[PDB]
Amino acid sequence: RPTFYRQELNKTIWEVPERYQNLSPVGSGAYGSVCAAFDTKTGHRVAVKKLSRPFQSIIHAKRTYRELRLLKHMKHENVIGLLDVFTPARSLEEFNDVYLVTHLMGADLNNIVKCQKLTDDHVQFLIYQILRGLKYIHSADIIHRDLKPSNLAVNEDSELKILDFGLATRWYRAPEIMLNWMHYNQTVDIWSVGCIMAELLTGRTLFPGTDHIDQLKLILRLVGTPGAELLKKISSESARNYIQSLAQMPKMNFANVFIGANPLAVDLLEKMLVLDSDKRITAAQALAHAYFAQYHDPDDEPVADPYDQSFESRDLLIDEWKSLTYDEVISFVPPPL
């Protein structure tokens, strides 16, 4: 249906619907190159990403499909959504290029945290929105695994969206995935949320480790060494023995570490930053914590539709991966705006 027009930007052809005007490069990452544009239909500024060599191998073809499937599925106020996806190809035989369109995201959360204490009311609202987003994501059996301030967009009204899905810094990474304990669940992302919240409250990174070793030491300084209960849940003897080497450390009183902070905030942090992922608070549980009393509404914290991930275990040829992606592109329907 739409008319396409072609132009040179950077060192390649961009061929996009005429609704998108005034394209100008903003950057280019490992996966794709990104242009800002003006959408004349909706009247918004947008980001147009052209994927790089999406079907170069089976690894990359499966990656393209995986990401497109997830981006299409995610429909929630606190999670990046897909405005449009298109190809200039008029058939599968001519299919090569894939373009993703999203809202032009403003500053990330680091920009807001200029090494200063945010007000408690500000922290409440930001952390509420992250957890609300995570509840949705986790309900689709997805784990982020690399949640950090730079993966969080915030606009002028303090409205927050989670930018990536985890398809530089280890400061926010849960220890059970650092140390390869093979004892983890979705609460790996909750650890990250705890690190982010603490930083927002103090203005300082909670565990600024210089390397893997120093990271662990800093963590155990605050939360204490693992108890026998957790030791026997860790599978590998290497990880088990490595923990048994380090000397015993008491769990610290968080109220002394976060002096002056809302006592409800301290209590939530204590539930977030525990080593045993079987005892770590989940997103749904954290939303019901008294800290978020003013924001919490169970009927306005939705879960995702069931998410079919059976493709992960299939072994297909490269043309099949490309064919499946093509299907997802041409059958795309914009969200009801």
Numbering used by the authors: 5 to 171, 184 to 353
Sentences from the study reporting this entry:
p38α, also known as MAPK14, is a ubiquitously expressed mitogen-activated protein kinase (MAPK) family member that has a key role in maintaining cellular homeostasis and tissue organization. The p38α structure is topologically similar to other MAPKs and consists of two lobes linked by a flexible hinge, with the junction between the two lobes forming the ATP binding site. The activation of p38α normally involves phosphorylation by the upstream kinases MKK3 and MKK6, but p38α can be also activated by non-canonical mechanisms that involve autophosphorylation. Here, we report the identification of p38α inhibitors referred to as NC-p38i, which efficiently inhibit the autophosphorylation of p38α while having a minor effect on the canonical p38α pathway.
